[PDB]
């Protein structure tokens, strides 16, 4: 399977949280969620076996 | 996890994969003296045979998951041997003409 790439803008592959509970999803949706509990940042739920499972907690 | 994914999705309603998955994991954990792929292939083939017995013939073997060297049986210049999940109960032979 040959997959070509030319566009270097890869903001769709990046998700981040910063500042006062600011979240940016992989798809570009920026929102605020002031949750201080333990939450699933990102996990591989699309397969029978999970490759990664990242969780973050705030204080 | 192959015993829980889309590969055996159709069989999940006809054969419960719980004990087969447990045996798979236990055998793969205990197959530490050499030849763990044989242990895994046997564990998955047990569930595959259970699926095939009740009418569901799923194709689970891939060149990276328990490959079968059918081409080994082809005579020089011939191409006859094929992988069958269902099997061929009444292929024509000269013992059952």
């Amino acid at each position: 399977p040959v997959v070509r790439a030319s566009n270097p803008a890869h903001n769709g592959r990046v998700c981040s949280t910063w500042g006062s509970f600011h979240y940016k999803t992989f798809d570009g949706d920026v929102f605020r969620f002031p949750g201080l509990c333990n939450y699933v940042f990102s996990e591989h739920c699309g397969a029978a076996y999970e490759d990664f499972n990242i969780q973050l907690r705030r204080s | 996890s192959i015993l829980h994914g889309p590969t055996f999705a159709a069989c999940h309603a006809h054969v419960e994969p719980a004990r087969y998955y447990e045996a798979c994991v236990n055998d793969a954990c205990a197959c530490d003296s050499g030849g763990d792929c044989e242990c895994f292939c046997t564990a998955v083939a047990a569930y595959a045979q259970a699926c095939h017995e009740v009418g569901l013939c799923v194709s689970w073997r891939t060149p990276s998951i328990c490959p079968l060297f059918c081409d080994y049986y082809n005579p020089e210049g011939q191409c006859e041997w094929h992988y069958q999940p269902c099997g061929v109960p009444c292929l024509r032979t000269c013992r059952n003409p």
């Binding site: 999970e50 499972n53 | 829980h4 994969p17 719980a18 998955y21």
Partner: protein, 97 residues
């Protein structure tokens, strides 16, 4: 029915469930006198699943342990003193007299 493993979804829940539900299968623990009358494997699995799954982990753990204790009592085995450590809250909180 789905092939979920709640204990794999949380490290701390797994640690708590393994630490407190393994007393069922301990040969010398508070439940060791009953390993002959009642086999504790199913109760251990139920304890693990319930503790990892439900939000009130201690309540489900205590429910599983009490279920095993009741099953033992149905066989004529008494396991008094098993509430030392965890599952001691029901001992103290009940009517005044």
């Amino acid at each position: 029915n789905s092939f979920e493993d709640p204990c794999s979804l949380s490290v701390e829940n797994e640690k708590y469930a393994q630490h407190w539900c393994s007393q069922l299968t301990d040969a010398d623990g508070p439940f060791g006198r009953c390993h002959a009358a009642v086999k504790p494997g199913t109760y251990y699995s139920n304890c693990m699943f319930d503790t990892c799954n439900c939000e009130r982990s201690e309540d489900c753990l205590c429910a599983a342990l009490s279920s095993y204790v009741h099953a033992c009592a149905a066989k004529g085995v008494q396991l008094g003193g098993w509430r030392d450590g965890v599952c001691t809250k029901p001992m103290t909180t009940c009517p005044k007299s």
